[PDB]
Design a protein around this ligand. Structure first.
Ligand SMILES: [Ca+2]
Ligand SMILES: [Mg+2]
Length: 430
DNA sequence: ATTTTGACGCT
């Protein structure tokens, strides 16, 4: 009752660039705009692997992970942009720099947590408080929310999508009590106004469109963002959670898409997030551990406390290459040459990072995979990173991995290497 | 033969 926490203390947004790599290429090449198109890395093997798909192309069934030749079977007019290749490998610099464009705009509005190259969480609590003080009890016009969906509405006693959107928004705004400045629903609504403004600024200043979710925590914000894509934003209120979760497969909630969510489903014999409310917190901890159990018990009620962390820059700078099937590295000189390629890209990115961000990496992590192992990484070893020098870094990585070679022969490498990975970590201010 | 990333938890 009066002491039951409701997880309504914050306003949190999750902003997600729509088909991001595709938009970067479409901004650069107008011929690709408003067309079925995809971004592909490499071209030799089956036309290349698709890593991003425009919504026009998704309408044909084109997906990420698809080979471009197969996507062309589904969508013969599919247009393709290739990821740059440098030093023998795919190079993602253009997309990292475009990401920085967007993150810097978002940071003008609020503290952001970089969640991935194309998405950030936004802590809007303070900004909402200030905006509420500016408004002076003035009601919020639907005109301030031209691309917002209110999940769960309309309901109760038009056949077009925008008409439904407006009907639900009208019902929401008509019910709102704008005089109570501590109303969580009002606070979410002002948050959505700010996010409309943020998304307008991003589009104006970069050309990039995005979707967003607005709710009271990160997990609900993330889930809300996916409900109406592309180029739209969705408000998920605390009150919407019971109905939303009543048919929501558990795997849709962030962190439950893998083995843990599968174990929740199997051990508990349930399918939907709302079905979790019928277990005690101790029951959930008994099956899934103290932390996961407490998290699940609160999350299925719409409550989560993970903070938006003030971190706009990545914590690691890495580069890796797979060597599948017959291309697996079988000679020492091969391994060394590719370590050098990876190390040279790493040095370039590290020097740029040091100049832009006043920090230096202090640890070099080296990871390899050996042929036959199902795990993504077979072995990981670290060494000191004391100089931004590609030859030193490649030599050191070889030093820490060279004992993995089972071969009795000197120049040969066995078992062959199917993956190399260099990662700079443990940054310190400089 | 998806590939190339990135953050975080466990022990
Ligand atoms: Ca995205
Ligand atoms: Mg994303």
């Amino acid at each position: 009752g009066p002491h039951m926490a409701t997880g309504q203390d914050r306003v949190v947004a999750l902003v997600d660039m729509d088909c991001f790599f595709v938009q970067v290429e479409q901004r650069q090449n107008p011929h690709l705009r408003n067309k079925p198109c995809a971004v592909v890395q490499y071209k030799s093997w089956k036309g290349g692997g698709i890593i991003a798909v425009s919504y026009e192309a998704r309408a044909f069934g084109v997906t990420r992970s698809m080979w471009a030749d197969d996507a062309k079977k589904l969508c013969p007019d599919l247009l393709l942009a290739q990821v740059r290749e440098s030093r023998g490998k795919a190079n993602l610099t253009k997309y990292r720099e475009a990401s920085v464009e967007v993150m810097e705009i978002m940071s003008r509005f609020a503290v952001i947590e970089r969640a991935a190259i194309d998405e950030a969480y936004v802590d809007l609590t303070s900004a909402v408080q200030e905006r509420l003080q500016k408004l002076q009890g003035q009601p919020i016009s639907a005109d301030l929310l031209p691309s917002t969906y209110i999940e769960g509405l309309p309901q109760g006693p038009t056949v077009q999508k925008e008409g439904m959107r407006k009907q639900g928004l009208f019902q929401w705004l008509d019910s709102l009590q704008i005089d109570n400045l501590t109303s969580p629903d009002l606070q979410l609504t002002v948050g959505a106004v700010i996010v409309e403004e943020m998304r307008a600024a991003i589009e104006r200043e970069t050309g990039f469109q995005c979707s967003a979710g607005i709710s009271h925590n990160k997990v609900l914000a993330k889930l809300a963002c996916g409900l109406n894509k592309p180029n739209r934003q969705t408000l998920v209120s605390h009150g919407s959670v019971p109905q939303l979760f009543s048919q929501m497969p558990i795997r849709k909630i962030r962190s439950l898409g893998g083995k843990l969510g599968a174990s929740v489903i199997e051990i508990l014999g349930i399918e939907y997030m709302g079905e979790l409310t019928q277990f005690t917190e101790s029951q959930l901890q008994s099956h899934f551990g103290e932390k996961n159990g407490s998290w699940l018990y609160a999350m299925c009620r719409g409550i989560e406390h993970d903070p938006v962390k003030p971190r706009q820059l990545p914590k690691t700078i890495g580069c890796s290459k797979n060597f599948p099937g017959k291309t697996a590295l079988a000679t020492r000189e091969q391994v060394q040459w590719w370590l050098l390629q990876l190390a040279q890209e790493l040095e370039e990115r590290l020097t740029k990072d040091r100049n832009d961000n006043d920090r230096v990496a202090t640890q070099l992590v080296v990871s390899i995979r050996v042929q036959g192992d199902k795990r993504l990484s077979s072995l990981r070893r670290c060494c000191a990173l004391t100089r931004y020098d590609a030859h030193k870094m490649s030599h050191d990585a070889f030093t820490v991995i060279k004992n993995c070679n089972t071969s009795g022969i000197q120049t040969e490498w066995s078992p062959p290497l199917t993956m190399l990975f260099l990662c700079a970590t443990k940054f310190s201010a400089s």
